[PDB]
Amino acid sequence: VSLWERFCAWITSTENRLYIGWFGCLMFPTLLTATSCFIIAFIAAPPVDIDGIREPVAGSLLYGNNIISGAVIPSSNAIGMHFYPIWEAASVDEWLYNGGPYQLIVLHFLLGVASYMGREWELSYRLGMRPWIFVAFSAPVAAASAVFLVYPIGQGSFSDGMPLGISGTFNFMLVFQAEHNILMHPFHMAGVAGVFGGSLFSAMHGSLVTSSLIRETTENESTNYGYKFGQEEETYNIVAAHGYFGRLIFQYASFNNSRALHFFLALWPVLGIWLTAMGISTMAFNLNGFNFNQSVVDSQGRVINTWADIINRADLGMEVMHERNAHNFPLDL
Amino acid sequence: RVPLWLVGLVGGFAVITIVSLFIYGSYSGLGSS
Amino acid sequence: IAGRDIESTGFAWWSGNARLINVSGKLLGAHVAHAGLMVFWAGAMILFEVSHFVPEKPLYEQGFICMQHLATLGYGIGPGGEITSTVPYFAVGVIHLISSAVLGFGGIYHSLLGPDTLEESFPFFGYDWRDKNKMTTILGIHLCLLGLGALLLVAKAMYLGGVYDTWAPGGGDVRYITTPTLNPIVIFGYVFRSPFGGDGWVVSVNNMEDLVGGHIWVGILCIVGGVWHIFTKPFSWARRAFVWSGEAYLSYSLAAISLMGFTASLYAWYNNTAYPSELYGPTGPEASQSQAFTFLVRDQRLGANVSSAQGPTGLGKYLMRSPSGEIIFGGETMRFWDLRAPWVEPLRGPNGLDINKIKNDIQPWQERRAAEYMTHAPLGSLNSVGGVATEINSVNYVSPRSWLCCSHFFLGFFFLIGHWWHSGRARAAAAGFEKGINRANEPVLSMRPI
Amino acid sequence: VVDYENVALLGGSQTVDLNNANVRAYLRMPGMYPAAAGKIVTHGPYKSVADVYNIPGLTNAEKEVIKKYESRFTAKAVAPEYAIDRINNGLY
Amino acid sequence: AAGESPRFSVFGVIGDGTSYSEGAAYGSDQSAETYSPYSVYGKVGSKDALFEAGNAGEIARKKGYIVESQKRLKNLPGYVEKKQWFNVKDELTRYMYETRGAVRGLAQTPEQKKLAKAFFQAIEEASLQATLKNGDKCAAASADSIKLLDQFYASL
Amino acid sequence: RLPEAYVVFSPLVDVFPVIPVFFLLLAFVWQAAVGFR
Amino acid sequence: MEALVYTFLLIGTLMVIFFAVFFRDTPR
Amino acid sequence: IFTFRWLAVHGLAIPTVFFLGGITAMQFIQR
Amino acid sequence: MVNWQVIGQLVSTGAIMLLGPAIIILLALKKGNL
Amino acid sequence: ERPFSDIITSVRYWIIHTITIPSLFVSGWLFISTGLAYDVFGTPRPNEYFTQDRQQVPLVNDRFSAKQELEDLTKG
Amino acid sequence: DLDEATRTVVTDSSGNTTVLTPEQVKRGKRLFNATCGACHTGGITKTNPNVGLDPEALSLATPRRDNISALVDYLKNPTTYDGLESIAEIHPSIKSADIYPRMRSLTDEDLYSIAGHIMLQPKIVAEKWGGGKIY
Ligand code: CLA
Ligand code: CLA
Ligand code: HEM
Ligand SMILES: CC1=C(/C=C/C(C)=C/C=C/C(C)=C/C=C/C=C(C)/C=C/C=C(C)/C=C/C2=C(C)CCCC2(C)C)C(C)(C)CCC1
Ligand SMILES: CC1=C(/C=C/C(C)=C/C=C/C(C)=C/C=C/C=C(C)/C=C/C=C(C)/C=C/C2=C(C)CCCC2(C)C)C(C)(C)CCC1
Ligand SMILES: CC1=C(/C=C/C(C)=C/C=C\C(C)=C\C=C\C=C(C)\C=C\C=C(C)\C=C\C2=C(C)CCCC2(C)C)C(C)(C)CCC1
Ligand code: OEX
Ligand SMILES: [Cl-]
Ligand SMILES: [Fe+2]
């Protein structure tokens, strides 16, 4: 045989501790470089001028932060959507002043997660499985891409992306609420229903399966020891569990098929997350949620308020105080 | 002896006309700005 | 009945259109019927938009997405972007509506009455999903048709009336493009450009000559490729890398169409040459630049010298410098300094905005355009309110740019999901384990322990 | 600063400080906003109210309206933080 | 007070019709015409329209545009002699922007239409040559625009 | 507004654009007619 | 001075993850 | 005539129709 | 003042909606290839 | 027993329902259209939010004298 | 309800009053929220917030604009705040209807209704016509 054939046989081998595959060639370097840069920048980075008004903001541990308030600041507003690699700065100090590491981390990270999906499919193929797990994983990837890349593209600046921090996430959420009126977009309601229903069904399924265990342990050992690796037993007792579910609610509602059950379980949260990601992506292009301000009037013509007006007051309060020194003109276009 | 694919059609017509009436009332009348 | 039940094919009713994979007679009828539906919608939408036209408001204040394309092609538009007559739109709608009937009848016939398979009486119109020569032949034929279409667009742009040009010397007007650019360096620098800010990849075309030259080159390339793929068969390096089945071809098409949808949405959002602002409305950056220009003009008229006015941060209230040196508008709109519009270029010199021209060379029409674009920014809500999120119900307007961008972006993402699903299934079925794990010979049980 | 003694002359009262008031403070005197106030707010410091009439350019019309409203004017010391924003102070 | 029936109007056909909040009216509440059932305004050429067609203001503003555009267009050769063709483009798109509308609104006889078409083609050629940086062609086209514009002014 | 010779047909024109969806619903109706064979 | 504590906690968590991944009880 | 299902279904159904009639009547109120 | 537009729209929509099920019923009655 | 699948078919069911349901629907319509709900629940009418004397919102300020306060605020 | 006392507004500089017919209110509201809404929504001016449409600013203009006649005159011939120069080239008007196509199909009744709506608004909403985002 040749050298290339041996290399290919080693790459696609299903006997290593961790599968490599051809997608792993793009996966591993990008994720590793993103991790290294993120750790170093989170620990020891200097303040970054995020808004382009020459007012740097500290975000690293060594400059007086804690775990909660630390972050990696997005790039400067003066840059916009321009590409800013290291070799385009006159010095490393200038590169760090304008928020260089954010772009590097984000780009290598997104490439890494795409390769992660590909690698999942590849191992599924090599193991003789059915190839539909990476489709399920595509939803968190879609949401992360939506925020990190799509929102800056629509708004025209990397500085509007979500900061890589804990309190930066809250700041992003609050400003997004103030500017786009989320919580009134039906796609956000779809996402909330998705997560709540996912938690509900996880708890219900766990309870039902755990309650229907046959007797193999008696008292003085954890019940988990009954199951053996490779044992043959369907994940319930049909009589007890089916009767319990058919008696708890009306008898017409009971899943007697494991396939349909475990399909519904997979389908619900994935669809919810897809819809909420598309909601964020569409709101990136200034298509906001429902507007119900001053919609109820009496006979004379005066305005009677509703709860939407209280929400509007909160939105105005958030809006008038964000980026205090950044605006010069009456409209925030 | 209605077959079980026409009465569902009647129910669908009823629900769709109720929803359409509610949307129209949303666009016109009280609470329409 | 055989071929239309689960017991004979699997494929329960909710996935019944998958029973047509190996039936080449009904598939033709199905595809023709969808084409007829598309033509019908085009004609009906044109007619509906024509019926509601009002000759006072601009086209972007009436919620139209179909009249703008015909207007850009040079039908019924005059100087500056005013609509004079609507007869050609009526003619286009009528022709589409009439052709839809023929297409639908053909689909219905070929689907409900014609032979189930064409591989027994019409050997020319037959295939096997695995005969590579036939697939290459079909691809080449329809590719040559695409090239002919591109050349037809070029011919319309050059000889048959002309196209609307928003950069015309004296305001937007219909003119003949007599000198298209043909130097391959420019076109293939457009193709091989980076997509980030300042470059924009192919969205950044900013004149009609480049557009016509590009469509010329595309026509030539498509014709040559069609002939080549007709007269040849796939090489060795391609045979060992692809999967040869119908679902694989479907997934291949799905990925490309998703990419095209993304590209079109970004065209609609950012470009203002193929989507002139007099018809679709100002772009995102254009409204902010207009606001800055309007307030600069007002403050200068009040008596200020707007070159040395200091802002709250000391950076410059009206004018400043971009990170490369050019003079740009101040404020939060420093991110949109890449904008180029026909109503701003009169004030731009060799190093950005010109101080003297700004001082004493601003015409009232520019002021009016700036005010209009400032007050008609692309911001709105789902129920068509218009304005910032904290505004009250007074106007009813959402720009067509937002609608087009959001819709085709949604479609692009879901068709990418299509690539993933249909391709994974195609490859798994080709390998031979899409039904489940063979319990007799589970492959995992014969691997070295980990 | 925390304490500014001449805060009532910035537009909240019947008297206007010619050295620190914004252009919006002359909107309550009819026939003066777009021209006379614009000329006033774009020129150098005045040691007294009589110094306004020496502005190069002032036409006879303007001078007349300023004389009409002369009783509501005063000239205090120049505050650098207030004098810079006499055309656009961020209020809309 | 103690009891009263809320006032009603279904779809605007049965009921009051005029209530300041009805919707889906398409008229039927105004004693005046409309351009179409889907419009917030009347016709343009109505008997009550204030704006006439062909006032002295039109033939004043358009003539002022034309004469000022001639005065401005007489400056191209000075720019071309200095190779400052960017100034040529800025001039060709700064004030002359209204000339297309003015000329197309002041062209009635077919010879005026032909002369306007020739002038527009000449100005387009001048702009193209300026973009391509060709001195002789752009100067000749500028002289062409000047002659055609003065001929059109004399014809009017 | 449509050309004067066709203004009478305006109500039909106001309904054409939505026809392509009724087709999608008709597919489900046809499937339900044969009892989801 | 608390940056030392934060860094120590984060590095300890990463060490625990490494040991869990690579030094694990066999599923058999 | 007195089964549990009868009571449940009618107790859930009668007010539903009453309220739906009320809402449809509300739809035509104009100030 | 009669507002014939709403009546015309309702009649047109009703006819268009009724067209399809009519042909389905006709095909079913004539023992067609459903 | 006698499940819904053939309950939906019984003709007597249909005729008694056609007799009964429209009476309830019309009763609800008349309940709204007569204006009796406004008096039962105390909801102000569209021309009753502000009276000629009181031009502000009528908030309740006392716990044990809510009856008299509401009687004052409504009409008196 | 919308009484006749509420529908009584000043019509002349002398102080004469006129009662607006019920249809004129709706016609004026529709015409306003469609030809001027984009820039004067809520009684403010988006392109120049120094010159609003509240009654106090109208009363302190140079030719005074707190009645129907002066509003109609302004719509026929706009001027600056002190009434010394014409701004018909940068403001919609009948005098400049060629520049602004939206003003080419307006009658005297339409201008009267628009002015009536402008005058009537401060008496209904109150302290919110030209107030801003605070209210
Ligand atoms: C060119 C486009 C295209 C084509 C030709 C096909 C073709 C096919 N697909 Mg595929 N697919 C595509 C795009 C495409 N796909 C995309 C973009 C996705 C991602 C969402 C999928 C996801 C997908 C899945 C998950 C599956 C298929 C399957 C199939 C096969 C059977 C499909 C069938 O019977 O439909 C029957 C169609 C219906 C029952 C219609 C259902 C109605 C939909 C769900 C609602 C749509 C609502 C819409 C937005 C409008 C709402 C209006 C309303 C409000 C009134 C067939 C080979 C199936 C397969 O593998 O079969 C072997 C299968 O399981 N496809
Ligand atoms: C664009 C949409 C579209 C198209 C073109 C088709 C086309 C087709 N489907 Mg299909 N399908 C669709 C959507 C679509 N489907 C959806 C959304 C679903 C999910 C509910 C299905 C579920 C489905 C199943 C389960 C099956 C098909 C089958 C078929 C094929 C035979 C159908 C047949 O025998 O008709 C029989 C129907 C009739 C005789 C009644 C309809 C008569 C006409 C078509 C009504 C319309 C006439 C029109 C209004 C008048 C035009 C007049 C003209 C002169 C202008 C055919 C190629 C079958 C197949 O594979 O066959 C091998 C099959 O088993 N489909
Ligand atoms: C029928 C249409 C309109 C009416 C009735 C109207 C009303 C008025 C009135 C009465 C004034 C007088 C100033 C004052 O009240 O003190 C004014 C000024 C003004 N209006 Fe409007 N307006 C209309 C359209 C518009 C539009 C569409 C704009 C778009 C920007 C606009 C912008 C302005 C500006 C900038 C001023 C102040 C100009 C200056 O003071 O120099 N107007 N308007
Ligand atoms: C196969 C199938 C299918 C499909 C189907 C289809 C898709 C069809 C199509 C069809 C079509 C797509 C059709 C079309 C038609 C058309 C027509 C029928 C037209 C006509 C027109 C006219 C008649 C017009 C008239 C007029 C004029 C001329 C002028 C103006 C006025 C008016 C407009 C009136 C389904 C899914 C169902 C089911 C399964 C099977
Ligand atoms: C018209 C026009 C234009 C354009 C032009 C042109 C010339 C274009 C071109 C375009 C093009 C020319 C495109 C291309 C594309 C390509 C692609 C898209 C490719 C892809 C690839 C793939 C897909 C592959 C894959 C793979 C791999 C990775 C390896 C192995 C495996 C496989 C095979 C799977 C312009 C702008 C000038 C202007 C306007 C007009
Ligand atoms: C154009 C034209 C026309 C038209 C035609 C057409 C084309 C039509 C046809 C078509 C159609 C338009 C049809 C449609 C129908 C549909 C329907 C009406 C459906 C219904 C639906 C439903 C009701 C469903 C339901 C259901 C069921 C049954 C079961 C399952 C579930 C569901 C819910 C889905 C005419 C004649 C006027 C003439 C002129 C021209
Ligand atoms: O960068 Mn971030 O936050 Ca979107 O709004 Mn405008 O820009 Mn700024 O302000 Mn608001
Ligand atoms: Cl700003
Ligand atoms: Fe399990």
For chain C, the three-class secondary structure string (H helix, E strand, C coil) is: CCCCCHHHHCCCHHHHHHHHCCCHHHHHHHHHHHHHHHHHHHHHHHHHHHHCCCCCCCHHHCCCCCHHHHHHCCCCECCCCCECCCHHHHHHHHHHHHHHHHHHHHHHHHHHCCCCCCCCCCHHHCCCCCCHHHHHHHHHHHHHHHHHHHHHHHHHHHCCCCEEECCCCCCCEEECCCCCCCCHHHHHHHHCCCCCCCCCHHHHCCCHHHHHHHHHHHHHHHHHHHHHHHHCCCCHHHHCCCCCCHHHHHHHHHHHHHHHHHHHHHHHHHCCCCCCHHHHCCCHHHHHHHHHHHHHHHHHHHCCCCCCCCCCCCCCCCEEECCCCCEEECCHHHHHCCCCCCCCHHHEECCEECHHHHHHCCCHHHHHHHHHHHHCCCCEECCCCCCCCCCCCCCCCCCHHHHHHHHHHHHHHHHHHHHHHHHHHHHHHHHCCCCCCCHHHCHHHHCCCC
Contact C378, C287 (CB under 8 A): yes
Which ligand ends up closest to the CA of K66? 3
Half-sphere exposure of A64 (CA within 13 A, CB side): 3
Q: At what angle do helices E85-94 and E135-155 cross, to 10 degrees?
A: 30
At residue C194, φ and ψ (nearest 5 deg) are -70, 150
Pairing between strand C327-329 and C319-321? antiparallel
Q: Which two tokens stand for residue A167?
A: 């309190």
* Helix or strand holding residue K18 (H, E): strand K17-19
Which ligand 2 atom is the nearest neighbour of the CA of C108?
A: 44
d(CA A233, CA A227): 9
End-to-end, the C-alpha distance of chain C in Å comes to 52
d(CA A245, CA A242): 5
Which ligand 3 atom is the nearest neighbour of the CA of K46?
A: 30
Q: How many angstroms separate the Cα of C113 from the Cα of each of C29, C107, F31?
A: 10, 10, 19
Q: Which two tokens stand for residue F37?
A: 């064979």
> Does the CA dihedral C422-C423-C426-C431 come out positive or negative?
negative
Looking at the complex, does the CB of residue B13 fall below 8 Å from at least one CB of chain E? no
Which ligand ends up closest to the CA of C202? 5
Contact K58, K52 (CB under 8 A): no
Q: Which residues in chain C are closer than 8 Å to E96, comparing Cβ atoms?
A: 169-170
Contact K101, C56 (CB under 8 A): yes
B2:J5 CB<8 A: no
At residue C98, φ and ψ (nearest 5 deg) are -70, -45
* Identity at J27, one-letter amino acid code: S
The CA C326 to ligand 7 mean position distance, Å, reads 23
- Give the closest residue to C417 by CA, choosing from A191, A120, A135: A135
A214 DSSP 8-state letter: -
Residue nearest to atom 2 of ligand 7 (CA): A160
Q: Is K72 helix (H, G, I), strand (E, B) or coil?
A: helix
Which ligand 3 atom is the nearest neighbour of the CA of K103?
A: 1
Which are the contacts of F21, defined by CB distance < 8 A and separation ≥ 6? none
- How many Cβ atoms are within 10 Å of C369's Cβ, its own excluded? 23
Q: Which two tokens stand for residue C324?
A: 């490369």
Pairing between strand C380-381 and A287-288? parallel
Q: Which residues in chain E are closer than 8 Å to B27, comparing Cβ atoms?
A: 23-24
Looking at the complex, does the CB of residue K125 fall below 8 Å from at least one CB of chain A? yes
Contact A111, A148 (CB under 8 A): no
A288:C389 CB<8 A: yes
At residue A238, φ and ψ (nearest 5 deg) are -65, -45
The answer to whether the CB of A221 is under 6 A from ligand 7 is: no
Contact A258, C358 (CB under 8 A): no
Which are the contacts of A25, defined by CB distance < 8 A and separation ≥ 6? A11
- Give the closest residue to A165 by CA, choosing from A64, A72, A60, A46: A72
d(CA C269, CA E77): 40
Which ligand ends up closest to the CA of K92? 3
Half-sphere exposure of A2 (CA within 13 A, CB side): 3
Please count the residues of chain C. 450
d(CA C328, CA C43): 45
Query: How many CB pairs below 8 A link C and F?
Result: 36
- Say which residue the tokens 């002038």 belong to: E119
d(CA C189, CA K129): 55
d(CA A124, CA E52): 77
From I8, which residue of chain F is nearest by alpha-carbon distance?
F11
Which are the contacts of C235, defined by CB distance < 8 A and separation ≥ 6? none
d(CA A160, CA A76): 10
How many helices (DSSP H) and strands (DSSP E) are in chain D?
3, 2
* Identity at A209, one-letter amino acid code: V
From A16, which residue of chain C is nearest by alpha-carbon distance?
C450
Q: Which two tokens stand for residue A267?
A: 């389908």
* Helix or strand holding residue F32 (H, E): helix F19-33
Q: How many angstroms separate the Cα of A130 from the Cα of each of A117, C430, C435, E98, K72?
A: 15, 12, 8, 67, 76
- Give the closest residue to A46 by CA, choosing from A69, A73, A19: A73
Which are the contacts of A186, defined by CB distance < 8 A and separation ≥ 6? A279
Q: Is H4 helix (H, G, I), strand (E, B) or coil?
A: helix
From C62, which residue of chain K is nearest by alpha-carbon distance?
K34
Q: Which residues in chain B are closer than 8 Å to E24, comparing Cβ atoms?
A: 24, 27-28
d(CA C8, CA C427): 24
Quickly list H helices, K3-107.
22-35, 37-40, 55-59, 68-76
> Does the CA dihedral E31-E35-E40-E44 come out positive or negative?
negative
Q: Is A165 helix (H, G, I), strand (E, B) or coil?
A: coil
Please count the residues of chain G. 28
Mutate to test the interface with G, among A17, A61, A231 (most CBs of G within 10 A): A61
Quickly list H helices, D1-92.
38-40, 60-68, 80-83
d(CA J57, CA J41): 18
CA angle centred on C251, ends C250 and C255, rounded to 5°? 120
Q: Is A82 known as a binding-site position?
A: no
Q: At what angle do helices K22-35 and K108-124 cross, to 10 degrees?
A: 100
The alpha carbon of residue H30 is apart from the nearest alpha carbon of chain J, in Å, by 9
Which ligand ends up closest to the CA of C218? 5
Q: Which residues in chain I are closer than 8 Å to E25, comparing Cβ atoms?
A: 3
Contact A50, A57 (CB under 8 A): yes
d(CA A124, CA A131): 6
Q: Which two tokens stand for residue C85?
A: 């007559």
How many helices (DSSP H) and strands (DSSP E) are in chain I?
1, 0
Q: How many angstroms separate the Cα of A333 from the Cα of each of C288, C379, C391, E21?
A: 6, 8, 13, 32
At residue C195, φ and ψ (nearest 5 deg) are -90, 0
d(CA J24, CA J39): 20
Q: How many angstroms separate the Cα of C160 from the Cα of each of C66, C154, C437, E113, J75?
A: 21, 9, 63, 19, 77
Contact C273, C211 (CB under 8 A): yes
d(CA G15, CA G23): 11
Q: Is B2 helix (H, G, I), strand (E, B) or coil?
A: coil
Strand partners for E14 = E10
Pairing between strand K8-10 and K17-19? antiparallel
Which ligand 6 atom is the nearest neighbour of the CA of I15?
A: 37
Q: Which two tokens stand for residue C313?
A: 């941060």
d(CA K46, CA C282): 17
d(CA E142, CA E122): 8
d(CA C199, CA A89): 18
Pairing between strand E9-10 and K17-19? unpaired
The alpha carbon of residue I28 is apart from the nearest alpha carbon of chain E, in Å, by 38
Q: Which residues in chain C are closer than 8 Å to K47, comparing Cβ atoms?
A: 294, 298, 371, 374-375
- How many Cβ atoms are within 10 Å of E155's Cβ, its own excluded? 12
All chains having 3 or more CB pairs closer than 8 angstroms to chain G:
A
- Give the closest residue to E120 by CA, choosing from C177, C173, C82, C365: C173
From B9, which residue of chain F is nearest by alpha-carbon distance?
F29
Q: Which two tokens stand for residue A321?
A: 């105080």
* Helix or strand holding residue A168 (H, E): helix A166-180
Q: What is the resolution of this structure in A?
A: 2.7
Q: Is K79 helix (H, G, I), strand (E, B) or coil?
A: strand
At residue A181, φ and ψ (nearest 5 deg) are 55, 55
The answer to whether the CB of A55 is under 6 A from ligand 7 is: no
Q: How many angstroms separate the Cα of E21 from the Cα of each of B26, C162, E7?
A: 12, 48, 12
Q: How many angstroms separate the Cα of C14 from the Cα of each of A47, C10, E4, F17, F36?
A: 57, 11, 55, 27, 9
d(CA C101, CA C82): 34
At residue C348, φ and ψ (nearest 5 deg) are -105, 130
The alpha carbon of residue C64 is apart from the nearest alpha carbon of chain K, in Å, by 18
| Chains F and H: 3 or more CB pairs within 8 Å of each other | no
Q: Is A271 helix (H, G, I), strand (E, B) or coil?
A: helix
The alpha carbon of residue H3 is apart from the nearest alpha carbon of chain B, in Å, by 25
The answer to whether the CB of F28 is under 6 A from ligand 2 is: yes
